[PDB]
Amino acid sequence: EWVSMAGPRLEIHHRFKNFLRTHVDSHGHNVFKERISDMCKENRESLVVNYEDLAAREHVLAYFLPEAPAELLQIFDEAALEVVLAMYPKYDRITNHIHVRISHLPLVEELRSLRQLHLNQLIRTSGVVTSCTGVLPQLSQNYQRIRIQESPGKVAAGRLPRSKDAILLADLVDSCKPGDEIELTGIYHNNYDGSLNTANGFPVFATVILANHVAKKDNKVAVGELTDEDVKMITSLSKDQQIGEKIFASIAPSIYGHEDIKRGLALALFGGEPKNPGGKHKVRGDINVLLCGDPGTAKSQFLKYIEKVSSRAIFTTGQGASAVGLTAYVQRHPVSREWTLEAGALVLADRGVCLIDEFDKMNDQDRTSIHEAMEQQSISISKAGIVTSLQARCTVIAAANPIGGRYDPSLTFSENVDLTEPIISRFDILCVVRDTVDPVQDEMLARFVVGSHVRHHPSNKNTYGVEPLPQEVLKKYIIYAKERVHPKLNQMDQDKVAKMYSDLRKESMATTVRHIESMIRMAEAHARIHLRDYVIEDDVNMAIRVMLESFIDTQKFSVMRSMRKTFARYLS
Amino acid sequence: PQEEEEFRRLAALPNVYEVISKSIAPSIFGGTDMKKAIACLLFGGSRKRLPDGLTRRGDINLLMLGDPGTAKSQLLKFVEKCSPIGVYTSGMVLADGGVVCIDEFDSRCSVLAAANSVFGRWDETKGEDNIDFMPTILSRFDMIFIVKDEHNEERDVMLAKHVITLHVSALTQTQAVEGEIDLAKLKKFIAYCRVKCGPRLSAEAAEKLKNRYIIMRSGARQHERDSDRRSSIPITVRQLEAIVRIAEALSKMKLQPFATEADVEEALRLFQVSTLDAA
């Protein structure tokens, strides 16, 4: 109301013009002139201004912007347009209206946190895009209506993900895709809808956010949020010669033994480097893990721990997972009735991890759709006249139980598990767990279990010999390693691997390229564990060792002894 | 209008056939005959009507059989990308004058089909009975090709080196090897050639093809009679029509109004190498 006064309004407009034409960065460069030159070169229609600098320079503007967003933003758009006209008179020929974008709002709020008090106020929110509409013209302009759900990782268990509507105009149109995690800065306005009033029986306003700035939530934001103390602790950990041992021992403290399974799962978690050689073929940088186990080996416990640790994680069961559920599907909107895409579990697992429990229960028809996403990490949906492509870069961990409930060592791994050969081929790491009656191991298991039971009472609330790391420290290490390291394989001896692969061919025909690729990305991940920009051959040796162990574990008993004798050089 | 002169210059060279063959999937090692067959399928023949109302097919049909790993799906994808109209299925109305690729074989459309062996891998000693399709549906295909995993110690090394070089050098540079035509340029050239004109055979070529057809029919006779077994790939007048169509496509590639004896000879050689080896 006070802003609507003409005098203060005009004075603030000219003050904002002086801010545009007067601000100086710490390096002595007028940033906005470079930004406007870049926009003119790119013929864009929007201008991005940092809220932090405006708050630092003009406190009154920073106070006014969240309170009177629409009028002040229109005034700033007019000021930017006239500044552009004064600086670039010809720019009226390419564009007729220029919009100001506000970025980095200090106040970030969740979709659950939306109340009445935030109505008609600028709010910053975070979420994941689920469905989007097309480009619609208006007799005023470009229109986009999208549906946003809360990020599954942030959502607590047992409570449904809530959904909201968002509107994008002109430049913001087509700036996002379904299944993409984004944060928004926009106005929380209310809309009048008589259908809701009739249905509920009282006045109801459907609140829809009109976003001003859209930013995809890449891990760059997470990198920025990292404290320098976290970085120094991670670097101090990296120089330790036994960093790998403590990292492996830090996973599943409550479970005793089973070094190979935790080794493989950590190695898959750290992930490799995806590559696109030539833009002609794409080599995946992801590890798919299969865990076949006799009952009583705490496979579900491992899956649950992985679910908790991961920043982004989705848990699914065998029986409740249909082909339509796992993937995105086409549906007619109940209100507007245009074809829309709803993302499945794998789509929301993009850049995250997906866990499959009781994978042996999968129907073959449901299995068929899995191979495409496993091999190409992308899904092509061709339904109801709509053909779309969606990213499916996810790390898949699957659990399985042998047919009959007991693993037979006298049979091949293919025979014991009711899965087709291509599915197993897509998996990079295979781990089989058996049950043996060893009195000393039984003593160790019983003692560790009873000790853990005593420790974790609510009233009361290693094999390598290394102290496990704190959970938060491990998570921070994982994030930093994922977002900083990019190893290079410039010191690999091709003759040794070629001879080993020839021997592998000999002893496999006696009983492929993707195995080589899996070993390569495994070495890359092991290098990423040590935070090394270049790969040392020790990573290659360890990857060879673990891959050979996994391969021999899948063979019959009559041949694994000969395999161990032949390959005693590498296993030692 | 300027592109018409470019297409005329490209088609007036004495080596258009070799350039087109090299332009068909330069990444894939070998298969020069398969590349030429794919090229002439893409160019295609010409349809002719008759006053009695009857129409004769102006499109070519090819079938491929071989062990897995012979790069069959890659050729189908390349054909679908290169063709102005292209459909790819996993096993027709929306395609008019285009090419339809059909994997797992076990309306004016050219058909390119891929299939696998009955037992999974080819058995040379068993000979016949490795194809489950009936002769009735096999007769429609103009040509049939058989690919086998020719295991050579040096050939595997060469293939691995070629694949690794393709993997490595692809980000570095994307350039034609020796005068290869761009995908868009080749697409426009094929469209222009198809739209512009369609050739017809000659009397001498017709007589030569008739004599060769009679000789080949007698040979297929004698092979069947001596073998005391019915061949799964019979030879009928449809094979003669297919050879005529291939010769017409070869003449169309040169935009000549009348086909020459060289086109008929090349068509006969390709038909021999495909069908007679397959049969």
Ligand SMILES: Nc1ncnc2c1ncn2[C@@H]1O[C@H](COP(=O)(O)OP(=O)(O)OP(O)(O)=S)[C@@H](O)[C@H]1O
């Ligand atoms: N090696 C182990 N060390 C410690 N506790 C274990 C171990 N194996 C099993 N347990 C305990 O046994 C409980 C039940 O194990 P489960 O996870 O149900 O067995 P499972 O191996 O997953 O086979 P299924 O999937 O249940 S048929 C776990 O929650 C653990 O508390």
Ligand SMILES: [Mg+2]
């Ligand atoms: Mg379990």
